[PDB]
Design a protein around this ligand. Structure first.
Ligand SMILES: CCN1Cc2c(ccc(F)c2C#N)O[C@@H](C)CNC(=O)c2c(N)nn3ccc1nc23
Length: 298
């Protein structure tokens, strides 16, 4: 549609062609602004009712971006997150499209997750996840990161709070690309010189020192995610406040083994926490080490 040139006239030409491939007509989307499912730094996430080509009314989550005041920053956000339109994996949150509107902000359309984020699903005292069920979640997250890493994409915010569960209990890595924001305002430290939002208790040791993220720092973060699942959503490093983490990790200290974490899986965690990033296993090694531990549960 030609609405891109008008409603997003601050976009680089090549990005105009990119976002044009994923535009949703306003007649296809019903945004339930009175049914807010959550908030965030960049804006709110509402309920949605998308209508596909055949006519299926699909439940979706619509992310508002009205809090980004600078209209040039909106173009940068779409510039950094448009690549996600090329991602199609069962364990990675797909992108349904973008609804554009001048005198307003572009609406990002994501599919709805019935059981919310993975952390609040396993912390909830009403659900009963067996040890095997929790390792199944970790295996799916490793499958999603194996795909993302294969696309040379760095997540730099991988945590149980950023993974989701659909109706069939399929885990989907999220909080990346156009769906990236800050939804838990207690775990992130804002850099006063660069503005980057850092999950310090999830970043690799080398990431805390130089502020860079590779495909090995998400392996470290994936280690926290496996620790969270075993502890059913306990806060990592509870006795170490955010200024001693870096010194805590330089001595070689790591997270203790959870009371119900099988020894082979903890071994996978320490591998993710190698001080040398090049010694950590790839997400393809993780998808074979964890799947083997998950298959012993027959
Ligand atoms: C924009 C996409 N987001 C936002 C979102 C969150 C929380 C954690 C996340 F990694 C993401 C992401 N990416 O929002 C939080 C305020 C709460 N989000 C939800 O309860 C939610 C749901 N039940 N389905 N569903 C689908 C998508 C979706 N959020 C949800």
């Amino acid at each position: 549609q030609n609405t891109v040139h008008i409603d997003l006239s601050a976009l680089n030409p090549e990005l105009v062609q990119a976002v044009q491939h994923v535009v949703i007509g306003p007649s296809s989307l019903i945004v339930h602004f009175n049914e807010v499912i959550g908030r965030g730094h960049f804006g709110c996430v509402y309920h949605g009712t998308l209508l596909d080509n055949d006519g299926k009314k699909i439940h979706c989550a619509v992310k508002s971006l009205n809090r980004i005041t600078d209209i040039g920053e909106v173009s940068q956000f779409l510039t950094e997150g448009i690549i996600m339109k090329d991602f199609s994996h069962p364990n990675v949150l797909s992108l349904l499209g973008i609804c554009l509107r001048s005198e307003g902000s572009p609406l990002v359309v994501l599919p709805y997750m019935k059981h919310g984020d993975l952390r609040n699903f396993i912390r909830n005292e009403t659900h009963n996840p067996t040890v095997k069920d929790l390792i199944g979640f970790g295996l799916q997250v490793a499958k999603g990161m194996k795909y993302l890493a294969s696309k040379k994409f760095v997540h730099r915010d991988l945590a149980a709070r950023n993974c989701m569960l659909d109706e069939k209990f399929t885990v989907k890595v999220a909080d990346f690309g156009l769906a990236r924001d800050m939804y838990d305002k207690e775990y992130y430290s804002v850099h006063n010189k660069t503005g980057a939002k850092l999950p310090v208790k999830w970043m690799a040791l080398e990431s805390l020192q130089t502020q860079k993220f590779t495909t090995k720092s998400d392996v470290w973060s994936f280690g926290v995610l496996l620790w969270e699942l075993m502890t059913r959503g306990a806060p990592p490093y509870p006795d170490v406040n955010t200024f001693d983490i870096t010194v805590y990790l330089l001595q070689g200290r790591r997270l203790l083994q959870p009371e119900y974490c099988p020894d082979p899986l903890y071994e996978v965690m320490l591998k993710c926490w190698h001080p040398k990033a090049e010694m950590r296993p790839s997400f393809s090694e993780l998808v074979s080490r964890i799947s083997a531990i998950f298959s012993t549960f027959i």
